[PDB]
Every structure is written in structure tokens, then in C-alpha cells.
UniProtKB/Swiss-Prot annotation:
It is found in: Secreted. Ca(2+) 2 binds at D138, E177, D185, E187, E190. It catalyses: Preferential cleavage: Xaa-|-Leu > Xaa-|-Phe. This is Thermolysin. Thermostable. The chain holds residues 233 to 548 of 548 of the full protein. Extracellular zinc metalloprotease. It comes from Bacillus thermoproteolyticus. Ca(2+) 4 binds at Y193, T194, I197, D200. Its main location: secreted.
Length: 316
């Protein structure tokens, strides 16, 4: 909407206070004009018709319980925009500052979040498996990263290409979590998963097998559930990425870590220059090796560590 840029204040899902960029025109709207062509947050009102209505508020204060998922979807979309722009020189998900749209309060008891081809969508959870999913910065960045992938490599959402697609979203979700630097870790979704269980998470990149996901190509899922295991076999790539950054010895193979900034550079270049819609795990290894070669040189430690990490997870 046309209006003037304003700054509201509210509380997110976890009870933390933050300022949010809003727009005033009769109401105060969750419309942040400070980033690209805007970040827009909508109320889906417990329905499944999208996007719903642009979030309107009478007083620019967002402290009601019903407001909390909207505050966080809006704010964390801004952090994710900033990460891509400041770290990778990428302007929104399409590289040309496309408007970023999110809807919260999707459906009832909805234990998921997704990119629908055009926007982000967040359930509230059922209060047992999840609380409102926009409360996790890694979750928000995971979802926006699906849009980045779809506009770039275009990885088809099944089998190995789909598991790469998933891992890319977990990797960049985690790197955005580190960028914001509030309780960062290599776990996925811990802030919104299972409020009655402390210390768990939906997935682990440091130890995927803690939640049943494979950490070696020889343990890959070969069935048909979950689009051929896209949220399962992502563990193999998540583990490789963790090893590139942090190092370790895994199935007897030692990896010298190069840190999370270089991980991000290597995987961003692979995603945007070398991967294709049908890339498999072996082709991702080759793309990561080539990316590290471009950035650091063929004889570099960075290239050597990429090779060791993929060796450690059984991907040649
Ligand atoms: C980061 C996480 C909290 C949320 C993330 N959502 P996602 O990976 O983003 C779901 N995304 C999804 O299924 O996309 C398919 C699609 C939908 C609409 C249009 C086109 C394609 C995700 O991992 N979900 C699976 C969990 C909930 C399991 C337990 C595997 C069912
Ligand atoms: Ca209000
Ligand atoms: Ca965390
Ligand atoms: Ca996390
Ligand atoms: Ca939990
Ligand atoms: Zn995903």
C-alpha cells in the first residue's frame, strides 16, 4: 500500500521485544519499505486461502498473542534479506528485489511451513509438535531459501536433487541464524519444536543420526515417502557442510574446518553458478569443488577440505 514508513514495536513468539518496519496509511501495516521492493506480512486467519489480508493494526504496537507469529515472520524475513544482500550481494530471492510476502496463522494446528511458489506460509503448530513456526529464525530463512533455490539452481523437489534443495535451505537457515547471532547452533528448528521437550530439534546438521537421518551415503533412504526422502537424505549433505565449516573425523575420514563464512561462499556459488534442476549428490560435490577452486585456488586448503568432507559422507 502507499503510505509513509514507520517503526512499530512488538513481541515475537518467544516473548522477545523487537522493532518492526511498518507503513502508515489509516492503519499501520506490516509492510517494510526499507528492503528492496518491500516485505509484506499477511493474516491467513486460520484458513488455507492465500495470502489472506495484509496485516493491519490500529496503533503500531504488536504485543497481542495473535500478533506474535506475524512480528517474527516479518522481522526474520528482514534479517534474511539483509544476510543475502550484505553477505552475498543478492537482492531478494530473485536477485532483483522481488517483494517478499509471508502469511501467518495458516490453517489450524498446522505443523509445517512452506514456500508455495510465490510466498512463505507459516502454520501455528498444534502446541505439541510445534509452536508458531515463524518463531525460528532458521525456519524463516529455510523457507526464503527455497525461493532462492527455485530462482537459481531450480532443484527438482524429489530424490537426490530434492535432498540437496532441502540441505541448501537448512545450511542457509543456519548461516542466517549465525548472522543474527542469537543462540546460534547447527540444529534446525529448535526454537519452535516440541515445547514440552528441552534440548531437541527437528534435524541436526552436526549429528543427523541423532534424529534418524543418514550421515553417510551408504545409509541413504531409497523409498518413496517424503518425495524420496528429501528431509531425510538432506542429512548427508548437512553433515558434509557441517564438516567443511567445523571440521571433524567422521567414519575415520578427517576434515580440516574452514569456517562458516567460507562454507557460505562455496555453497552460494555452487547453488547460483553450477547446480542444475537435476543435480545429484555427486554433481553437488563437483560443483562445490569447482566453486572452492574459483574462490580459493586449486591447491587451497578450502578445496582439500571440500573433498575430505564429501569423502567422509561417502559421496564421490
Ligand atoms: C524447517 C522446518 C521447521 C520446516 C520445513 N518446511 P519445508 O521443507 O519448506 C516444507 N515445504 C514443502 O513441503 O514444499 C513442497 C511444496 C509446497 C507448495 C508448493 C510447492 C512445493 C520442513 O522441514 N518441513 C518438514 C517437516 C515438518 C517434517 C517433519 C519432515 C514433516
Ligand atoms: Ca496493536
Ligand atoms: Ca538456535
Ligand atoms: Ca538452529
Ligand atoms: Ca523442544
Ligand atoms: Zn524445506
Amino acid at each position: 500500500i502507499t503510505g509513509t514508513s514507520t517503526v512499530g514495536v512488538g513481541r515475537g513468539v518467544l516473548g522477545d521485544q523487537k522493532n518492526i518496519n511498518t507503513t502508515y496509511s489509516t492503519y499501520y501495516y506490516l509492510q517494510d519499505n526499507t528492503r528492496g521492493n518491500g516485505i509484506f506480512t499477511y493474516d491467513a486467519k486460520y484458513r488455507t486461502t492465500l495470502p489472506g489480508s495484509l496485516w493491519a493494526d490500529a496503533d503500531n504496537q504488536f504485543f497481542a498473542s495473535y500478533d506474535a507469529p506475524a512480528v517474527d515472520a516479518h522481522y526474520y524475513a528482514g534479517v534474511t534479506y539483509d544476510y543475502y544482500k550484505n553477505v552475498h550481494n543478492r537482492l531478494s530471492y530473485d536477485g532483483n528485489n522481488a517483494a517478499i510476502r509471508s502469511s501467518v496463522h495458516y490453517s489450524q494446528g498446522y505443523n509445517n511451513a512452506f514456500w508455495n511458489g510465490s510466498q512463505m506460509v507459516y502454520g501455528d503448530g498444534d502446541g505439541q509438535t510445534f509452536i508458531p513456526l515463524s518463531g525460528g529464525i532458521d525456519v524463516v530463512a529455510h523457507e526464503l531459501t527455497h525461493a532462492v533455490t527455485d530462482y537459481t539452481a531450480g532443484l527438482i523437489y524429489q530424490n537426490e536433487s530434492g535432498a540437496i534443495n532441502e540441505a541448501i535451505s537448512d545450511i542457509f537457515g543456519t548461516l542466517v541464524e549465525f548472522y543474527a547471532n542469537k543462540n546460534p547452533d547447527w540444529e534446525i528448528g529448535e526454537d519452535v519444536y516440541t515445547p514440552g521437550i528441552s534440548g531437541d530439534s527437528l534435524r541436526s546438521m552436526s549429528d543427523p543420526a541423532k534424529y534418524g537421518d543418514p550421515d553417510h551415503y551408504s545409509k541413504r533412504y531409497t523409498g518413496t515417502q517424503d518425495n524420496g526422502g528429501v528431509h531425510i537424505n538432506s542429512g548427508i549433505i548437512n553433515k558434509a557442510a557441517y564438516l567443511i565449516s567445523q571440521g571433524g573425523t567422521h567414519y575415520g575420514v578427517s576434515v580440516v574446518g574452514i569456517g562458516r563464512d567460507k562454507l557460505g561462499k562455496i555453497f552460494y556459488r555452487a547453488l547460483t553458478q553450477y547446480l542444475t534442476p537435476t543435480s545429484n549428490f555427486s554433481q553437488l560435490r563437483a560443483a562445490a569443488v569447482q566453486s572452492a577452486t574459483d574462490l580459493y585456488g586449486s591447491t587451497s586448503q578450502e578445496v582439500a577440505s571440500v573433498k575430505q568432507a564429501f569423502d567422509a559422507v561417502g559421496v564421490k
